[PDB]
């Protein structure tokens, strides 16, 4: 039995973060012998093989995420979930012991309360994770004020994606990462990505070409607008892949939504609220390295984006118009 | 092959192909004469038979 | 073990591809020499009277 | 780990003209098309954006240089240029060749900005390759602002003209310089300009009172060093606004949406990627710094 437990000793101490670089002045220049992985140019041979490079494949870089541990209600979170959704933090108030409330993106979908035409395929799915959009909107009463002043992209913090998570019948726990590639729990030594609903992104880089230059990155950037739709204000989530750095989207966001800033400002000439004003802003969700190919799926139909190697890096909101 | 002008490199590259078995069918009738069945299965006990 | 021992025949030859995508570039790049050193005929005949 | 290495190939023979002032800058930053080890000399210019004939338009030279990664040279070769790479977050040597000169210390801050002063002493023409290479110029990061604050004045008041000292000349403490404007193409410098006529005059309607009304106490008696651009007369305009009375509830609402808007203006005033710099050497000229990301 102790066999099972010779296991958990090789295990925890091949699994640690690296000592710190100290040796004793009196050892001598041996310390140049203990710096392995700053050694970057291995020799080849005429025919070389894994026996003279298995010590080239043994130093790799040290990568360790910061997970997240939220314990959410059975009827907000979905029971179901493609594992690798985006989530939100919404907060109010703490008003319970350790109470937590989680929004995916169709979920969102859902409290705002859009026409069936700007998304025309999780309009379906979504109206079938949950009821008519009651359910959801007896827990926050304020959806009417929070949307007129202003303060609802005050009041999300940007997660990342899904890692695990164990359901119950009425607390629905959640692992969630952060600051990069969460590890997946199910199958080993695999490494969980970012789904997003092909109805929900816009891609930004898209020519003919009728030349733009390559680069190690590509910022998925997160968009939220206040509008107003029947007299009623609402809002709207829409997604970014671009890599063009963060002085053209924001005047390649307002070439998108410019037909949703004329509509809403023909009815300010009547009456000018400074609380009216404010119309969206924009978080940066983390960086995508280059060329990775965002593979389409089906799920049910529902097509569903995926992104390999995806790490997540929280931003702030910035108030664009 | 690797080159020196520089455009891209190229990663290894693999296929994997399918194939298939077609199967066929075969007939070809074969006639007997209803009455030549019917003197076989009885015995001969004349030198006409 | 098959597992082990079936990764250590896909690293291999992901690095026999290495070098022999490299041999490869011997043989294009002296043909690429060759070939800028080399006038047609039409030019070059009437250069060798 | 990482390494970081790119060796250029080229085709033909360098003179010994050309060398001299490559080897000259041996440390400094051009920025560079793709992420390979080998590569084609008609990326390593910032040229391929601004070249002689093609009229150059330094806010879309602006908006290119931060799409692009940036490498730091090591050696000149008589054959091939070799070059080092710069990724987020990299502690890294640079070395300051650049010619209209400033001075850096410890602790300082950095960015990256087209060649605005003297583009025939900024580039270098290949004769024997005919493809031209152009240098970018690091700045720190108040003049990094200055000369961008300048050059968006000066399109504004080229197009009422459809003279020059006040227009093309940045201003620092103890020296003056001159923009290099003789063939600029406003169009991508205008479309800045239209979106500053969006922020601009939604802030003109939401102003507090308040505020205004400290202006109309303060600049007629109580002259004070930074309030010399009124000249010691209110506009005619702050004392039309001013007739309503003050109350605190109205400019709550106002000044917090007067802080929103200034979170904006970051992102029409954006440099390139920037550069933190630690630890800075003097008479060596080398420093010590972090690449930033976009």
Not at chain 1, 92 to 105: A, I, R, V
Not at chain 4, 64 to 92: F, G, H, I, Q, W
Request: charged share 20%.
């Amino acid at each position: 039995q102790a066999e099972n437990a010779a296991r958990l000793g090789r295990q925890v101490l091949g699994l640690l973060p690296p000592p710190t670089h100290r040796v004793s002045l009196t050892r001598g220049p041996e310390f140049a012998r203990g710096v392995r992985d700053l050694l970057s140019k291995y020799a080849a041979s005429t025919r070389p093989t894994v026996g003279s490079l298995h010590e080239a494949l043994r130093q790799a870089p040290f990568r360790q995420p910061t997970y997240g541990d939220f314990l959410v209600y059975s009827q907000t979170f979905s029971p179901q979930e493609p594992l690798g959704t985006f989530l939100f933090s919404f907060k109010q108030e703490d008003n319970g012991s350790s109470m937590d409330m989680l929004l995916t993106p169709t979920s969102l979908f859902m409290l705002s309360g859009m026409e069936a035409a700007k998304a025309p395929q999780t309009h379906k799915v979504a109206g079938v994770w949950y009821g008519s959009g009651s359910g959801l909107a007896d827990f926050i009463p304020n959806l009417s004020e929070l949307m007129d002043t202003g303060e609802f992209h005050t009041l999300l913090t940007p997660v990342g994606p899904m890692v695990q998570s164990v359901h119950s019948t009425f607390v629905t726990k959640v692992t969630s990462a952060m600051k990069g590639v969460g590890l997946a729990r199910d199958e080993p030594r695999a490494h969980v990505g970012l789904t997003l609903p092909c109805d929900m992104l816009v891609d930004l880089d898209e020519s003919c070409p009728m030349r733009e230059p390559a680069g190690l990155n590509v910022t998925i950037y997160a968009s939220l607008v206040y509008l107003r739709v029947n007299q009623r204000p609402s809002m709207a989530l829409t997604f970014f892949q671009s890599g063009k750095g963060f002085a053209e989207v924001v005047a390649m966001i307002k070439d998108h939504f410019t037909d949703v800033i004329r509509t809403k400002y023909i009815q300010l000439r009547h009456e000018l609220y400074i609380n009216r004003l404010v119309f969206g802003a924009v978080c940066t969700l983390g960086t995508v390295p280059f060329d990775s190919h965002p593979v389409h799926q089906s799920l049910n139909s529902l097509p569903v984006l995926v992104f390999a190697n995806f790490e997540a890096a929280c931003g702030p909101w910035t108030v664009f118009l | 092959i690797a080159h020196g002008d520089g455009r891209r490199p190229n990663k290894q590259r693999q296929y994997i192909v399918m194939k298939a078995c077609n199967k066929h069918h075969i007939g070809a009738e074969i006639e007997l004469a209803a009455a030549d069945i019917e003197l076989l299965f009885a015995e001969k006990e004349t030198p006409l038979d | 073990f098959t597992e082990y021992a079936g990764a250590i025949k896909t690293i291999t030859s992901a690095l026999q591809f290495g070098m022999d995508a490299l041999e490869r570039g011997l043989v294009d790049t002296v043909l690429a020499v060759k070939l800028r050193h080399a006038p047609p005929v039409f030019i070059l005949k009437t250069l060798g009277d | 780990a990482l390494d970081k290495s790119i060796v250029v190939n080229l085709t033909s023979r360098l003179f010994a003209d050309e060398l001299a002032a490559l080897q000259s800058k041996i440390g400094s930053v051009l920025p560079l098309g793709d992420c390979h080890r080998l590569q084609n000399i008609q990326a390593l210019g910032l040229g391929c954006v601004c070249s002689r004939e093609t009229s150059p338009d330094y806010i879309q030279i602006m908006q290119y240089l931060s799409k692009c990664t940036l490498a730091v040279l090591e050696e000149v070769r008589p054959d091939s240029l070799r070059l080092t790479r710069m990724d987020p977050s990299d502690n890294l040597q640079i070395k300051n060749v650049y010619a209209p000169f400033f001075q850096w210390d410890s602790n300082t801050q950095l960015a990256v900005l087209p060649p605005l002063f003297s583009r025939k002493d900024s580039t270098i023409v290949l004769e024997s390759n005919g493809f031209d290479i152009v240098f970018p110029m690091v700045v720190p990061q108040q003049l990094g602002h200055a000369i961008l604050q300048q050059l968006l004045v000066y399109h504004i008041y080229s197009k009422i003209s459809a003279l020059d000292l006040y227009t093309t000349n940045v201003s620092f403490m103890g020296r003056t310089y001159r923009l290099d404007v003789d063939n600029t193409d406003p169009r991508t410098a205008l479309r800045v300009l239209d979106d500053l006529s969006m922020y601009l005059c939604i802030l003109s309607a939401l102003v507090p009172r308040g505020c205004l009304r400290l202006l109309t106490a303060l600049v007629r008696h109580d002259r004070h060093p930074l309030t010399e651009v009124f000249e010691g007369v209110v506009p005619d305009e702050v004392t039309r606004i001013d007739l309503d009375q003050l109350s605190v509830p109205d400019d709550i609402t106002r000044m917090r949406v007067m802080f929103s808007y200034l979170q904006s203006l970051s992102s029409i005033f954006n440099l390139g990627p920037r550069l933190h710099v630690y630890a800075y050497s003097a008479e060596t000229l080398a420093a010590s710094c972090w690449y930033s990301p976009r």
